Design a protein around this nucleic acid. Structure first.
Ligand SMILES: C[S@@+](CC[C@H](N)C(=O)[O-])C[C@H]1O[C@@H](n2cnc3c(N)ncnc32)[C@H](O)[C@@H]1O
Lengths: 34, 261, 126, 238
DNA sequence: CTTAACATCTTAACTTTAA
DNA sequence: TTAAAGTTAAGATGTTAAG
């Protein structure tokens, strides 16, 4: 999801690499769809 | 505060739950084993196989202390005609803690848990209340009643001791287990926290109130469920207290050892 | 005896390199990050020399000659973003730039940021 | 649902732009000279105490202040439930045996002063034995009562009783009767909140500084939470 | 000897619900 | 919205089977 990595207990770099891995997940999903 | 709910009254809500029972008069549940001197009294002769030992001993902190020193603990006798599977509940201090536990482990009992009482001075409560502002009241009737001063910061209220180190506000009771073979101990534990705040008196902190001693007694009673009265403690009770007084000690299911003068 | 010079002497003697500074002062930049995720000046110089040593864009071979540890790719890209001064790295692929011209176009990027009149925390956007 | 994850990806781009700007601002104020909560006089050391070279610490402390440590604090990593207790408290750090804690030299680090060892219920006798064989003599006990966010006793699970306390034992080493080490100070009971995992209250440092003002302090098994002023602090994750 | 699994608890924060 | 209960996660527990 998107709201599970937005925690106030999470430091900014950890959040940001979570969103980067999440972009990797969307990129692979679009590769699968195409 | 306004509805009579502060930090003090939030921690002193147990006091209205516990009420001292009347003196038993059955001649079936109180054992009078009064002798001249316990150190001069031969133990394990009338009692037997108890599972909760209470030693209400006033410790000799220094020369001027009017109590019993640890040499009276050295002369104590505990054998197999005495507490065998049970637990000792003994008052302990900080100066003689190492010697107390070391001499108790020379008899078989080893430490298990702690249970202390946070002293809150009633005199400090009324003095802080009258400084913030409830007069003509000594803390004795404050002990006997529930009319306690309001206090939202309770760390100021503690008793002022006279230690030559960190000041003393502590009434730690030491619990010591006597593990034995081929006999499981029936316990009903986790029913009471190790800390409860209790109100004490200024310049006289070496005693717990009637309700506090009731709290300790009921703690022991719910801790070991088979040592209280279930249709079988006829004479041979499974709980005994040493030293005692004519204040709270004669109990249904409790052997009381006195100290003749 | 004061405790300031005392503290500097203790830190200069037995404290770690990432905790004390060169004169013994406290490295405060290390104590507001996590443990092991601090960006050391040695790591900074390693990234600066590895930009020229190997190719740019792909950071796998950059991480090969890096400290081989807490050197995740995303943080390397995100700090090179401020090293060179822009967020668009994908359009700068295949460009090997040394430290002098890195400072040159960093100054140029900050300058064009202050001309475009929407500069945000000394970083030019694209 | 192509549009669904496409819109998710656009939201991802917006959030990453937001966080990139957030961390860029953080790095810019780091380079600008932002100061942390750690006081400027703290002396942190980050190494395993099993592998630490206490000779260097002894030499430096002797050669700088002209005196040794006058207070040692200790929060040993006792052996409890590791990461999934399944009924009670997790203890989210490594545990040290009693032999390993006993091995390290403490009697060399002091000649006159106090020690502060925080014991748990299972390791009360063990702590007494440690500080009795190190040369110290058991003198005092400091207990931390844990209150909760609205100001009542915070009870935690136990075996015989519910546990709502924490124990610290204090043994002196040598001469105390000097200008330092003021007597009849503070209280043995610290009534304070539960501000973290095994995080002792900040009032213990206030009581220590009341015990001996502007002294030479050592503290093994440290985290960034305290890192106090004029304190030498050894830790693993410092 | 060490890890994993046992009850025999209390309290605050989050979630759902009738008003 | 609102306060009023259900539900859940957190607390530096001691003892015992299983290799
Ligand atoms: C009890 S915790 C510290 C708690 C701290 N006193 C507080 O007030 O929160 C023990 C700490 O000692 C450190 N430590 C653990 N194992 C260690 C080891 N083997 N050697 C050195 N330090 C260690 C870790 O930093 C760990 O967090």
């Amino acid at each position: 999801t998107l709201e599970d990595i937005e925690n106030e207990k999470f430091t900014n770099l950890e959040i940001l690499t979570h969103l980067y891995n999440l972009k990797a997940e969307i990129v692979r999903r679009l590769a699968e769809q195409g | 505060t306004e509805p009579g709910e502060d930090q003090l009254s939030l921690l002193l809500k147990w006091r209205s739950s516990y009420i001292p029972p009347q003196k038993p008069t059955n001649e079936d549940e109180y054992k009078k084993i009064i002798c001249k001197d316990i150190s001069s009294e031969k133990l394990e002769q009338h009692a037997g196989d108890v599972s909760a030992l209470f030693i209400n001993i006033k410790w000799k902190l220094s020369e001027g202390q009017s109590g019993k020193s640890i040499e009276d603990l050295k002369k104590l006798a505990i054998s197999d005609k005495l507490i065998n599977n049970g637990i000792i509940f003994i008052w302990s201090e900080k100066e003689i803690l190492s010697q107390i536990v070391d001499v108790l482990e020379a008899k078989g009992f080893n430490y298990i848990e702690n249970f202390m009482i946070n002293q809150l001075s009633a005199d400090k409560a009324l003095e802080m209340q009258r400084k913030n502002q409830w007069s003509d009241i000594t803390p004795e009737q404050c002990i006997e009643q529930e009319k306690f001063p309001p206090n939202n910061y309770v760390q100021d209220i503690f008793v002022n001791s006279e230690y030559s180190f960190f000041r003393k506000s502590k009434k730690i009771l030491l619990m010591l287990r006597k593990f034995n073979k081929d006999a499981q101990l029936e316990l009903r534990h986790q029913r009471t926290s190790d800390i409860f705040f209790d109100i004490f008196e200024q310049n006289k902190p070496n005693d717990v109130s009637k309700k506090g001693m009731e709290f300790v007694y009921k703690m022991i009673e719910t801790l070991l469920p088979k040592a209280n009265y279930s249709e079988e403690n006829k004479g041979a009770f499974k709980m005994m207290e040493l030293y005692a007084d004519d204040k709270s000690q004669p109990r249904k299911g409790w052997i009381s050892v006195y100290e003749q003068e | 005896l004061d405790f300031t010079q005392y503290a500097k002497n203790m830190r200069k003697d037995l404290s770690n390199q990432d905790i004390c500074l060169e004169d013994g002062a406290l490295n405060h930049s290390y104590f507001l990050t996590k443990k092991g995720q601090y960006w050391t000046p040695l790591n900074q110089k390693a990234l600066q020399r590895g930009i020229e040593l190997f190719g740019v864009g792909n950071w796998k071979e950059i991480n090969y000659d890096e400290f081989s540890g807490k050197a995740n790719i995303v943080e390397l890209e995100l700090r090179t973003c401020m090293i060179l001064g822009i967020n668009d790295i994908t359009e700068y692929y295949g460009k090997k730039i040394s430290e002098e011209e890195q400072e040159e176009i960093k100054k140029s990027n900050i300058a064009k940021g202050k001309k475009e009149n929407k500069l945000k925390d000394n970083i030019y956007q694209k | 649902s192509k549009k669904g994850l496409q819109g998710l990806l656009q939201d991802i781009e917006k959030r990453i732009l937001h966080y990139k700007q957030l961390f860029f601002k953080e790095q810019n104020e780091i380079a600008n000279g932002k100061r942390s909560m750690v006081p400027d006089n703290s002396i942190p050391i980050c190494s395993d105490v099993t592998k630490l070279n206490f000779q260097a610490l002894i030499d430096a402390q002797m050669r700088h202040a002209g005196k040794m440590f006058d207070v040692i604090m200790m929060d040993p990593p006792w052996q409890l439930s590791s990461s999934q207790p399944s009924r009670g408290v997790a203890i989210a750090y490594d545990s040290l045996s009693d032999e390993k804690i006993q091995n390290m030299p403490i009697q060399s680090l002091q000649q006159d002063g106090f020690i502060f060892v925080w014991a748990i219920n299972a390791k009360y006798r063990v702590t007494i034995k440690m500080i009795e064989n190190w040369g110290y003599k058991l003198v005092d006990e400091i207990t931390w009562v844990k209150k909760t966010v609205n100001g009542k006793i915070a009870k935690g699970h136990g075996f015989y009783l519910q546990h709502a306390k924490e124990s610290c034992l204090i043994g002196v080493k040598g001469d105390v009767d000097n200008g330092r080490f003021k007597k009849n100070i503070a209280s043995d009971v610290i009534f304070s909140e539960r501000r973290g995992q095994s995080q002792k209250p900040e009032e213990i440092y206030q009581y220590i500084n009341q015990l001996c003002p502007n002294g030479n302090y050592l503290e093994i098994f440290a985290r960034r939470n305290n890192l106090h002023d004029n304190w030498v602090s050894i830790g693993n994750e410092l």
